[PDB]
Amino acid sequence: GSSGSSGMKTILSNQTVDIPENVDITLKGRTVIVKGPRGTLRRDFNHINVELSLLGKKKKRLRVDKWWGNRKELATVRTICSHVQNMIKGVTLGSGPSSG
Template sequence: MKTILASQTMDIPEEVTVTVKAKFVKVEGPRGTLTRDFKHLSLDFQLTEGGRKLKVDAWFGSRRTMAAIRTAISHIQNLITGVTKGYRYKMRFVYAHFPINASITNSNTSIEIRNFLGEKR
């Protein structure tokens, strides 16, 4: 059975600006700008209350479309977290038989892995 209209809203923090144009969401904050394209989902995005709330609607959607509403809001909340607090990733090298050698290059922006799977160059 299809639901006629399902919608959810989310609050946007004061230090963040969200713009929506044709399922293309752009989030700007103190740490930069992130964008995400939701064209593969059949959802409607609207900014309400002067850009302080984001409303996501699904018209005549199936169960899969209803689940996509919460997924889209979660993705946008992750974008907001990325431009306000940021994310930090830690990487650990693990090997079973052949040892891996790694070096950081390009002024700490890339990692070069040497001797991967026992290759000798």
């Protein structure tokens, strides 16, 4: 079961994002733009050097990738993914958990 060993291994593991039809998202280089019937929110990830890919097998899906290696992608993916997901919900619902 349990598994762990000190070192470094290029663990190829990318994340996939799903998007509805009532929302329009424009991808430009390293900037993610989200448009909703409740507002428009965009984010820029230039300052940060990562990997990304456009997927649309069935629906407008976004692929988030980062320096393949340690389990760092876990925290980076959760943060980046949350940002995009939060934007959609905010532009499709109104606002998010953001307090004050």
